[PDB]
Every structure is written in C-alpha cells, then in structure tokens.
Write a protein that binds this ligand. Structure first.
Ligand code: IHP
Ligand code: IHP
Lengths: 288, 288
C-alpha cells in the first residue's frame, strides 16, 4: 500500500473512466470574444489547452482542432510520471505531485517508462486510487484492475497524427530555465501556423503559465503585463496567475515565484521583440 | 549555374542555418515504450539515428548519447558527396541525389574531397541553393556565401571523440552486397556495447533500413519479419519499410527492391543466429 512518499508513491486515476470528457478545453483565440480590454494579437493564435485527457478525450480534442483548421504539436507540460491504464489517465503521485522533482528530464522519462513497463507486465494492477481517495489518504482502499492496456501519452497522440513534445515543469511551479529555453526554441523552430495543444494534469496552473508565455513572446511589446495576465484569465477555467494565495497555503511561495518569473519573462519577451537575440538563459544571466 | 545533371550538379544546403536543430533524432530502444507488439530484444540496443546534422546538431546528438550512457561510432550511410559550409550541411546533388552512383567507394570519397577542397580554396562560393529552390528548379537563384569554413563530416565527428565509418548506400536504394558485408563486419568487429549513431541525408529510408538490419541480426530468430519492420516504424518519423509507393513514383522499383533485400537479409540473419557462419555475399550466392 502506498503512502504518498517518494519511496512508496501512489497510483492515482485521473480519468473517472476511459470515456470521461474534457472539462477544461479552451482555445486562446476565444479571449477576443470575452475579454473587455486590450485584445491585440489574440485572435490569430493556433493554441488550445486542457487537463489530462482520457482516451476518449483525445478524440474530442482532435475533432475540436480539426474544426478550427498544418502541423499539430501536443505540448505535455508534466514533469511527473503519468500514463494510461485501460484508457484512464493515471499519475504516480508523491506529496504535492513531485515524484520527479530535481531529476533530469532523461531520468524523469526513464522512471516513467520503467513504471509503465512494470504495470504493463502485470495481469492485475492493485492499489489504483481515485483522486478523492488519495486526497482522503485512503491508501489501502484502492481497486484492483485487470490490465487490458498500459500506454503512455505518445500512444494516443501518435494515433491522431500529432507530434508529442514534453516540457518538464514541476506541478505548482514555474518552469526551470532549461524548459523555458526549450519552449522558446520549439516555437521558433516550427512554422508560425503550427497548432499547439497545451496540457498539464489539471489544465490550470502550468497550462495557463505557458499560454501567457506564448502571448508575451508575440505581444509583450504592444500589451501590458497586467493585461496579458488578465486576458489569459478571461476564459474558462479563469485561471488568474496574479493570485498567489490559493487552496493550499504551503504552496504560496511557488505561486509567488511563478508570478515573479512571468514578470521577468515578460521583459525578456519585450526586449526580444525589440532586437535582443539571445536565449532566456542568456538574457536572465545579464538581467536578473 | 547548375542543372542537376551529373555534368553540372547543384550545391544544396540541407541545414537552414549552422544552428538548426536535429528534427529526426530517435533511439531504437524507445520502441519498447511505444510499440504494442513483440518488443523482444529491443530495449538493450545502443542505437540512435537522425538526418544530416548541422554543426550545432552534432552537439545535441553528442549530449543525447552521453545521457543514455564505451565507444561511439557515427555511421554515415550516404554514398553521395556531402560536407559543410560555414557549419551548414551541404550536398552535391544530381537527379535523385545519385551523384556517386556506380562509383567505387574510393572514388566516391575522392570525388567528395576534391569537391570540398575546391570549395575550401574559394573566398566566395556561388550558387548555394536551399532544398526548396532545388526542388523548384531555381538553379540560378542560389546565394553567394563568404567562406568561413569548409569541412567534411569527420571534422565534427572527430571533435566529439567519436569514430566515423561510412557505408556507401545510394539514396532511395538498398545497400549493395559490399556494403551489407561491411556493416555486418563492423558490428561483429566491435564490442556489443558499442553505441552507433546512424544517419543518412533525411534520416528516413537508409537510416531505417539499417535500423532494421541491426534488429534482424540480433532478433530474427525470435521476432517475425513483419514485426521487425512494424516495430521499426513505430517511433518517429514512423518510416515504414513495407511502403513501396511513396512521394516519387519513379522510385517505386527501388523501394520494392529494398524490401525484397530485407526479406532475404532477414533469412540470412535468422540462419546466422542458427549456425550459419559465412558472410552475406557468400550466403546470397548459395540462396538467391
Ligand atoms: O488536476 P486537478 O484535480 O484539477 O488539480 C489542479 C492541478 O493540480 P493537482 O492535480 O496536483 O491537484 C493544477 O495543476 P496543473 O496540472 O494544471 O499544472 C493546480 O494548479 P496550481 O497549483 O498551479 O494552481 C490546481 O490548483 P488550484 O486549485 O489552486 O488552481 C489544481 O486544482 P484543484 O486543487 O482544485 O484540484
Ligand atoms: O532529406 P529530406 O528532405 O527529409 O528527404 C528525404 C530523403 O531523401 P531526399 O533528401 O533525397 O529527398 C530520404 O532519404 P535518406 O537520406 O534518409 O536515405 C528519403 O527516403 P526514401 O526515398 O528512401 O523514402 C525520403 O523519402 P520519403 O519522403 O518518401 O520518405 C525523403 O523525404 P521527403 O521527400 O519528404 O523530403
């Protein structure tokens, strides 16, 4: 039985079933129809986001993207190990969902796939908790499930003809410099018409952070910091990156640091649109 | 001005810039995390591949290989003459990229280095075409570039501490018997832990062919022909050697012949794992 430590992490089932719908799907361009302030540079984005989809959720997302259309890149923002059991999204959860905190991206991927390979070799997976059970610390009341399939996200992304690219952001936290560099390079290294579907575990904090980063990279020289953050918060689920006191108070330092990073990324983006040609890591060394 | 004939071949720049990233890097071992069928004998391969890297691409490849680790052998599969101008990968292109077709490997190397030496003696190289320009037959719209450096691949491979070994495969075609012999001997003559980075021009046809050959040599006695080909097609760029009708229909005969060779190489590999001790050329004489 798990105990949410890194030594005995929990299998937590994020999808209620393999048919569960996507509840936090949205397209950034819709901000132009809801936000009452500066909407300059919004309505042309090829950018959607969501929480972690179920098997069926990927179908709905693919259909949504096709209706709004080039290349489609699914942007997985999750550092933590995750995958699918019988079409249901699952996560390997330690306290604050930081199972892979402090690891190289190579080790994070290795640990995830070693875990998924282990589950895949079993006929029965025990100790599968729902999110309510995990929150309630009912570590021994998990269910035993006959294994039909165990898959990583790539399996479902590849099946839709999309690319998969992972940015290893720790839950509740700002991206590390390596991952900022990687995101900026990805955007620069792909056509401007590329569609990105950004997702995290909950489609809230990390997803909205990256939405804001996209917005700044394109518009920081014609839209104020406050309006970029505000307009990103204007569409459901209305995630406001200005808020640093949230449901879990022990996480406030990380929300404050994440907003502080966004302040600096905004200036980096603005100066980049004005002539600066280096990377985020190079700019940060000279300016912070 | 060039005209894509062997008498006036074109200088074609494969790298957009000297900083262009590697877009088709993958490791064969990853098949074990994506392929839903027989994965026996995959997860221990020390095998990566890519398209022709830019100067900077070699750095990324070296870093990738170090993260997954003995000797490292860069396996250049390209018969055609190629090199680098100011850090950008370049190719001497005749129709269907067959500038060195029918030549001995010694002559191919000689012709390449005579060409590179000629470019290196110039302060300005004229007629440098991008791939789009070449495809569009805009032979006179090439750019003139001040020569900072002209290098062969060895220069960058040696700088990373890797070995360089060339297998002279014609673009779009199966390897000739001499080159099959050479590949099999190379694998046999080096430790089983040796890391191989296999690349062609596009990191598609020739690279995937050799991936399959590696797989067969180790696993043909426990994995079916169809599953070796299928599992090699399971990871990006999803090159499926079963497909013989591709973008260019005049090349279908060569794709069919390449698949036919793989059928025979599979049997050779299987019998070799079962006791046969001769070379491919010896086996082919007795069995085809
Ligand atoms: O998946 P959910 O059940 O909807 O939970 C989300 C998820 O975090 P957890 O799943 O670990 O609880 C969000 O993170 P992302 O995967 O989208 O990055 C997190 O975002 P932040 O901590 O950055 O805010 C958010 O937190 P919050 O509620 O404060 O918005 C939290 O939501 P819930 O606590 O309501 O489940
Ligand atoms: O380098 P690319 O622009 O990506 O082109 C590649 C490259 O051929 P060319 O560069 O000469 O066009 C592949 O060859 P390799 O160097 O990897 O051996 C070739 O492989 P095949 O002809 O064997 O299939 C492939 O062809 P295809 O598209 O049919 O996969 C083709 O791709 P593109 O035509 O899309 O450029």
């Amino acid at each position: 039985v798990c105990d949410s430590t890194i030594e005995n992490p929990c299998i937590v089932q994020d999808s209620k079933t393999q048919f569960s719908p996507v509840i936090r799907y949205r397209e950034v361009a819709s901000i132009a129809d809801v936000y009452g302030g500066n909407i300059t540079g919004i309505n042309k984005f090829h950018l959607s986001g969501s929480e972690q989809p179920s098997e069926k959720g990927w179908e709905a997302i693919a259909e949504s993207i096709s209706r709004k259309m080039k290349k489609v890149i699914v942007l997985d923002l999750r550092q933590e190990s995750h995958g699918y059991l019988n079409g249901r999204a699952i996560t390997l959860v330690s306290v604050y969902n930081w199972i892979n905190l402090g690891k190289s991206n190579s080790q994070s991927t290795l640990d995830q796939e070693n875990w998924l390979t282990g589950l895949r070799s079993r006929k029965i997976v025990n100790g599968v908790l729902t999110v309510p059970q995990y929150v309630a610390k009912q570590y021994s009341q998990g269910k035993s499930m006959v294994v039909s399939t165990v898959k990583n996200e790539e399996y479902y992304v590849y099946k839709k003809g999309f690319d998969y690219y992972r940015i290893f952001i720790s839950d509740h936290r700002a991206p590390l410099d390596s991952e900022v560099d990687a995101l900026v390079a990805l955007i620069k290294n792909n056509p401007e018409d590329t569609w990105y579907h950004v997702h995290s575990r909950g489609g809230k904090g990390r997803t909205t952070t990256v939405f804001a980063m996209f917005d700044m990279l394109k518009n920081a020289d014609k839209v104020s910091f406050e309006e970029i953050i505000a307009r990103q918060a204007s569409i459901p689920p209305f995630y406001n990156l200005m808020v640093t006191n949230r449901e879990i108070p022990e996480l406030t330092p990380y929300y404050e640091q994440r907003l502080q990073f966004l302040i600096h990324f905004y200036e980096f983006a603005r100066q980049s649109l004005m002539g600066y040609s280096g990377t985020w890591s190079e700019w940060k060394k000279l300016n912070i």
